[PDB]
Amino acid sequence: AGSGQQEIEQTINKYSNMLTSIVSSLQYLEKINEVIRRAWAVPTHGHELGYSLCNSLRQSGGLDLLMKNCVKPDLQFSSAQLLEQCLTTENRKHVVDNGLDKVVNVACVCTKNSNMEHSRVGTGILEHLFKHSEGTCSDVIRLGGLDAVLFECRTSDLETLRHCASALANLSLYGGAENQEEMILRKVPMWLFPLAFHNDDNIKYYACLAIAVLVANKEIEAEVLKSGCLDLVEPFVTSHDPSAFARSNLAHAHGQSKHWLKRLVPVLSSNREEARNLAAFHFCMEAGIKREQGNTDIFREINAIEALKNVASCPNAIASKFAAQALRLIG
């Protein structure tokens, strides 16, 4: 077993070669899910360890293996549970182009059954599949992915809601004009209201963030305001430490992807102050996460510096201090 937190990389190749040896037996052990699960959960290097294991899973042909055998009944959940953990930026592109129907369908049926663990695996797959493209988000909405995350919004489990809240925030960004319109028809703010008021700071944060991205589209601004969840943003940002809430969320992983933050930049120049208060609250949260690893040039690659400067000068003191500390943590 692996334990501690040292510079030894000899642990990675042992479990990467073991991962490639089990995959090399294709023509059910399924202990690959139990090891990547704990490989992710490493305190400080889990993001470095998990990405290497999932890369060895894609480089050895195991990614194409989980997609073909997910139609077999006795191998459905084990393949989907291992696929839910290894949906990195590299593996996710290969999943969409060849067998997106096989993966979305097994994610929908995992949420329809009364087992909570199957419900968490399903929404965990739909959460990641909403972080690709507009065409991908439109296809998942067509195949029924949007119905499954909204159907799981009535749950009581926390881990399932955390997947359902994070799925709707990713769809709000990667969706676009036509897909955000579809979310208004599916009454997404109707089911984001119970998530926006959750006592869990994780569920409340990403629920409001999804709603904040939805008022950025000037065609649906009135419908998103009808829910009344934007009036909850200000008491949150004025009572939550950005450094501490960066350690409870997106500390394990090295923040959000650059393509994810690029989609959030236009929220900084929105009509509503509550949207700017939360968008700047996220970039001030991402600045320290990026500064720890030394990749602050990400914000210059996504034209986020131009927006943060216009916000650091606006009379709104809430978004002023958040956009200021972010820029000081970048350069």
AA identity, residue 138: S
Contacts of 73 (CB under 8 A, 6+ apart): none
Which value in Å is the resolution of this experimental model? 3.3
Ranges of CATH 1.25.10.10 domains, the chain: 65-228, 235-331
- Superfamily for domain range 235-331: Leucine-rich Repeat Variant (1.25.10.10)
**Domain 65-228: which topology?**
Leucine-rich Repeat Variant (1.25.10)
Q: Is there a contact between 121 and 80 (Cβ–Cβ < 8 Å)?
A: yes
Q: Is there a contact between 276 and 319 (Cβ–Cβ < 8 Å)?
A: yes
Question: Using CA atoms, how far apart are residues 130 and 50, in angstroms rounded to an integer?
Answer: 20
- Our CA angle for 269, 256, 125, nearest 5°, is 115
Technique that determined the structure: X-ray
Q: What is the CA radius of gyration of the chain?
A: 20
Query: Token pair of 253, please?
Result: 């992983």
- Our CA angle for 254, 255, 260, nearest 5°, is 130
Using CB atoms within 10 Å of the CB of residue 101, give its burial: 0 to 12 exposed, 13 to 18 middle, 19+ buried. exposed
Please tell me whether residue 64 adopts helix, strand or coil conformation.
Answer: helix
Helix runs in 24-68, H state only? 31-40, 46-59, 62-68
Concatenating the DSSP letter of every residue in 144-186 gives THHHHHHHGGG---HHHHHHHHHHHHHHHHHS-HHHHHHHHHT
What is the distance between the terminal CA atoms of the chain, rounded to a whole angstrom? 41
